[PDB]
Amino acid sequence: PQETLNGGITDMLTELANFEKNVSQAIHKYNAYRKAASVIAKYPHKIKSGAEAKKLPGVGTKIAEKIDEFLATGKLRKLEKIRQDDTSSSINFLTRVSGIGPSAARKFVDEGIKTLEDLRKNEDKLNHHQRIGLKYFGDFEKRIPREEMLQMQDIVLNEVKKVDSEYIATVCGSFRRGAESSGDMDVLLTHPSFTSESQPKLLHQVVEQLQKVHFITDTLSKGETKFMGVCQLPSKNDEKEYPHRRIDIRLIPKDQYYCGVLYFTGSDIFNKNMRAHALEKGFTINEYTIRPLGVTGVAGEPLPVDSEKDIFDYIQWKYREPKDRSE
DNA sequence: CCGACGTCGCATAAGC
DNA sequence: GCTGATGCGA
DNA sequence: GTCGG
Ligand code: NA
Ligand code: NA
């Protein structure tokens, strides 16, 4: 399917989704509209009516109604109205700043703070995260070409090995599935000395080395197991600077690493199907472990996992490359 | 009819 | 001061 | 908002 097939409907639903999350603060309506937009974006026909669309799982009576009015008039009275509402459109916009959620955006607009300009004049009202999000507003909304991701991966793997050659690092997400672009970099980290039944400095030393070679530029959050921050590729001589990128790094126990790598490689539709096929076979898979059920649903101890393939073996599936993990 | 809708690490607030 | 709740992102 | 027990 292509854009001009049902793009008007999906953009409409996505827009409605954002106002639910950011303004009405109804996260489940937000996910409902998104789910509806997703199943429509994949539907290989130009939708003629709300009734036709209601067949798809995720599209109910109200969205069917809203599709009918769009097809007949080319717009939605409610969407048009909230679009021009100065208060609501500002709350919705401010949430595009990383660190500014629905609650913060509401507070800012409550006291006349509506724009990036307003945010820039009111730095003392921003926490550390929001300042970084403000500083890199444009960059954070840019996607990352795979070639740059490869160059980013090169640096991460190199410095990680340089700190301790026994570290194991894996860049997951859509990148590992071979996507041509990425929204951010998701790095999963482990070490043989770190298990579940067992230094608290393993993550810090890696972050430290990446900051020191000036790859990591900023820190959003950082604990003993999870790092969230900003990075940037070195500028190729005289040429234009690279955009600042979002990078996450997590330290996972060795015995939970490949369950983690599997989960955060995705896709989410693939994960869903996989942990659906697994209950069938008497196993429960989460992001950490795989456990056996249990003649009455009582989960047993986590099974030993030493690779992604090990998980597939447990539930009698053949190993499927990250490339072929869209569903 | 009515509850589910993912879950959790980290920063920060909020109350004690 | 310490702790649980909340906000946020993923 | 949608699904389903
Ligand atoms: Na439906
Ligand atoms: Na935000």
- What is the domain partition of chain A in residue ranges? 3-85, 86-142, 143-263, 264-326
Residue A190 backbone phi and psi in degrees, to 5: -150, 170
Kindly tell me the burial class for residue A91, based on how many C-beta atoms sit within 10 Å of its own C-beta (0-12, 13-18, 19 or more).
buried
**Rounded distance, CA A274 to CA A327, Å?**
9
Q: Which nucleotide is nearest to A225 (CA to C1')?
A: B9
Task: Please tell me if the domain spanning A3-85 has the same topology as the one spanning A86-142.
Answer: yes
- Is A59 annotated in some ligand binding site? yes
**Overall resolution, Å:** 2.2
**Rounded distance, CA A59 to CA A67, Å?**
10
A86-142 to CATH, choices 1.10.150.20, 3.40.50.720, 3.90.1150.10, 3.40.50.1370: 1.10.150.20
Which 8-state DSSP code applies to residue A132? H
Q: Give the fold, CATH level 3, of A3-85.
A: DNA polymerase; domain 1 (1.10.150)
CATH class of A143-263: alpha beta
Q: Give the fold, CATH level 3, of A264-326.
A: Beta Polymerase; domain 3 (3.30.210)
Cis peptide before A267 (omega within 30 of 0): yes
SS3 A35: helix
**Rounded distance, CA A182 to CA A149, Å?**
8
Ligand 2 centroid – CA A205 distance (Å): 29
Buried b / exposed e across A110-122, counting CB within 10 Å, b at 16+?
A: eeebbeeebbeee
Which residue's alpha carbon is at the shortest distance from the C1' of B11? A221
Ligand 1 centroid – CA A275 distance (Å): 23
Question: Are the beta carbons of A90 and A98 closer than 8 angstroms?
Answer: no
How many angstroms separate the CA of A98 from the C1' of D3?
32
Which 8-state DSSP code applies to residue A169? E
Q: Which nucleotide is nearest to A203 (CA to C1')?
A: B9
Residues of A with catalytic roles: 66
- Helix and strand counts by DSSP (H, E) for chain A: 16, 9
Using alpha carbons only, give the angle A145, A273, A141 rounded to the nearest 5 degrees.
25
